[PDB]
C-alpha cells in the first residue's frame, strides 16, 4: 500500500462519502497491474456489518460490461455475428420494423429507440415477445443512440441461444469461471448471503427487484476483489488463457459508434486519453432520464485503443457503481457503494485518483 495511493484514495473518497452520505463503500485501485483495496462504513446498518473485501454489491449496469464480453466471446466462438439479423436468433420476431435491425444495433443501443426499461407489466415470456413485436422505432436503425436495457438485454439473451446454455450458465462457465471470479453472481447463493450488502434508498434497506432481462442488463453482484480482477482482465486481455474470451474482451472494447467525444463498445464506453475531465464528468450525468443522440458509424470499428479512458457507470435503486481504466497506463479503479449517488460525483472522484497516479 504505497503512501501515494493511500493518500490520494483517502483524500478523495473520505469527503465523497461525507458529501453523499454513502453508508458503505469499497474501492480498488489497479496500479501498474496490482490491486490495492480500501473499505469504509457499513454493508448492513441495522446489523452493524462492515464493508469488507468480501462484501457483495449490486453492480447495476456495470453488468452490461459482462454481457458485452460474453457476447464478444460468442462472436469469437463463431456462434453469432453482430452483422446477423435479430430474427436469425428469434424467428418469432416477424414484425416488419425488425428488418434491418442487427445484433450490433441491439448491443449498442442503436436499433432505433428501444426504451430504457422493459415495462414492469412484462411478466411472461409471451409478454416479452408481444412487447418487441409491438415496439415502434422512432428512427431508422443505426442512426441514433438511446441507452436501453431492452436493447442490450435482448442482445445478451439472444447471444447465448446457439450455445443452448441459459444466460446464467453461459456467463458462469465462459466468463466468471475462467477469470476466477468466484464471488460474482447473477443470483446470490444462500452460502453468500452473509456477505450481500443492503442497498439504501431514502434510508430504507433494499435489494434489486426481479424484472424481465434483469440478469442481462443490470443483474450482477460482485466483490471489490472480483471487480479488481475484472479490471485486470480488461486491462490485459492477452494474459487470458481462453482464446475466445481474450478475443471477446477485445471485441467489447472496439469502437462501433461515436457521439460527441464518446465511443460505444459492447457494454464498455470509451473516450480517447487524455480525456477532458469535464467531458467524462459532465457526460456521466443521466441528463438525464432520456438522452437520444445522433451517432456516427465507425466503419469498420476501431479495434480496442490502448490510449483510452474505458468506463461504465451502474445503478440499482440502492447501489451505485463505477469502473474506469486506461490500458496504456495499466491503471484502473472500481468504486462500489450501497447508495445510488450522482454519476458526476463518481467520475470526478475516479478522475482525481487516476490522474494523480498516471
Ligand atoms: B444501469 O444504468 O444501472 C440501468 N439503470 S436503470 O435506470 O434502467 C435501473 C434498473 C434497475 C433498477 C432497479 N430494479 N430494482 N432495484 N433497482 C433501477 Cl432503480 C434502475
UniProtKB/Swiss-Prot annotation:
Consequence of substituting residue 290 to A: Reduces binding affinity of inhibitor compound 3 about 30-fold
Effect on the protein of changing residue 218 to G: Increases activity about 180-fold with respect to cefotaxime. Reduces activity about 100-fold with respect to cephalothin. Reduces thermodynamic stability
GO cellular component: outer membrane-bounded periplasmic space
GO biological process, one term: antibiotic catabolic process
Effect the entry attributes to changing residue 64 to Q/T: Lowers activity more than 1000-fold and increases protein stability
Outcome of substituting residue 286 to A: Reduces binding affinity of inhibitor compound 1 about 17-fold
One Pfam family in the UniProt entry: Beta-lactamase
Source domain of life: Bacteria
Entry binding sites for a beta-lactam: 61, 117, 147, 149, 315, 340
Induction remark: Can be induced by beta-lactams. Expression is not up-regulated by the non-beta-lactam inhibitor, benzo(b)thiophene-2-boronic acid (BZBTH2B).
InterPro entries: Bact_CellWall_Synth/Modif, Beta-lactam-related, Beta-lactam/transpept-like, Beta-lactam_class-C_AS
Classification via SUPFAM superfamilies: beta-lactamase/transpeptidase-like
Record field: catalytic activity: a beta-lactam + H2O = a substituted beta-amino acid
Regulation: Inhibited by the beta-lactamase-blocking agents avibactam, enmetazobactam, relebactam, nacubactam, vaborbactam, taniborbactam, zidebactam, and beta-lactam-analog boronic acids, via a covalent binding to Ser-61. Inhibited by non-beta-lactam, benzo(b)thiophene-2-boronic acid (BZBTH2B) and various cyclic boronates. Not inhibited by clavulanic acid. Inhibited by O-aryloxycarbonyl hydroxamates, via cross-linking of the active site Ser-61 to Lys-312. Weakly inhibited by citric acid.
Main location class: periplasm
Miscellaneous field: The class C beta-lactamase family has a specific amino-acid numbering system known as SANC, for structural alignment-based numbering of class C beta-lactamases, or else the simpler name structural position. A multiple sequence alignment was used to derive a consensus sequence and then the consensus was numbered taking into account insertions and deletions. This allows use of identical numbers, e.g. for active site residues, despite differences in protein length.
Self-association state and partner proteins as the record states: Monomer.
Similarity field: Belongs to the class-C beta-lactamase family.
Task of the protein: Class C beta-lactamase which confers resistance to penicillins and cephalosporins. Has benzylpenicillin- and cephaloridine-hydrolyzing activity. Has weak cefuroxime, cefotaxime, cefoxitin and oxacillin-hydrolyzing activities.
Protein name stated in the entry: Beta-lactamase
Higher taxonomy: Bacteria, Pseudomonadati, Pseudomonadota, Gammaproteobacteria, Enterobacterales
Gene (name only): ampC
Amino acid at each position: 500500500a504505497p503512501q501515494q495511493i493511500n493518500d490520494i484514495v483517502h483524500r478523495t473518497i473520505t469527503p465523497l462519502i461525507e458529501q453523499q452520505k454513502i453508508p458503505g463503500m469499497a474501492v480498488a485501485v489497479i496500479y501498474q497491474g496490482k490491486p490495492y483495496y480500501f473499505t469504509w462504513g457499513y454493508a448492513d446498518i441495522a446489523k452493524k456489518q462492515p464493508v469488507t473485501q468480501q462484501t457483495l454489491f449490486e453492480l447495476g449496469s456495470v453488468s452490461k460490461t459482462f454481457t458485452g464480453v460474453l457476447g464478444g466471446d460468442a462472436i469469437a466462438r463463431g456462434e453469432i455475428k453482430l452483422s446477423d439479423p435479430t430474427t436469425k436468433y428469434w424467428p418469432e420476431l416477424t414484425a416488419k420494423q425488425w428488418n434491418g435491425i442487427t445484433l450490433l444495433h441491439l448491443a449498442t443501443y442503436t436499433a432505433g429507440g428501444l426504451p430504457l426499461q422493459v415495462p414492469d407489466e412484462v411478466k411472461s415470456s409471451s409478454d416479452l415477445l408481444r412487447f418487441y413485436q409491438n415496439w415502434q422505432p422512432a428512427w431508422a436503425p443505426g442512426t441514433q443512440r438511446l441507452y436501453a436495457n431492452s436493447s442490450i438485454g435482448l442482445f445478451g439473451a439472444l447471444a447465448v441461444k446457439p450455445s443452448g446454455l441459459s444466460f446464467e450458465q453461459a456467463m458462469q462457465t465462459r466468463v466468471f469461471q475462467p477469470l476466477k471470479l468466484n464471488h460474482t453472481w447473477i443470483n446470490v447463493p444462500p452460502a453468500e448471503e452473509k456477505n450481500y450488502a443492503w442497498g439504501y434508498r431514502e434510508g430504507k434497506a433494499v435489494h434489486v427487484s426481479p424484472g424481465a432481462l434483469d440478469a442481462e442488463a443490470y443483474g450482477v453482484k460482485s466483490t471489490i476483489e472480483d471487480m479488481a480482477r475484472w479490471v485486470q482482465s480488461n486491462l490485459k486481455p492477452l494474459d487470458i488463457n481462453e482464446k475466445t474470451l481474450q478475443q471477446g474482451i477485445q471485441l467489447a472494447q472496439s469502437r462501433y459508434w461515436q457521439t460527441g467525444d464518446m465511443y460505444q463498445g459492447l457494454g464498455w464506453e470509451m473516450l480517447d486519453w487524455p480525456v477532458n475531465p469535464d467531458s467524462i464528468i459532465n457526460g456521466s450525468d443521466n441528463k438525464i432520464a432520456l438522452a437520444a443522440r445522433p451517432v456516427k458509424a465507425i466503419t469498420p470499428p476501431t479495434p480496442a485503443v490502448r490510449a483510452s479512458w474505458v468506463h461504465k457507470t451502474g445503478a440499482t435503486g440502492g447501489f451505485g457503481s463505477y469502473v474506469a481504466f486506461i490500458p496504456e497506463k495499466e491503471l484502473g479503479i472500481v468504486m462500489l457503494a450501497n447508495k445510488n449517488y450522482p454519476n458526476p460525483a463518481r467520475v470526478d472522484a475516479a478522475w482525481q485518483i487516476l490522474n494523480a497516479l498516471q
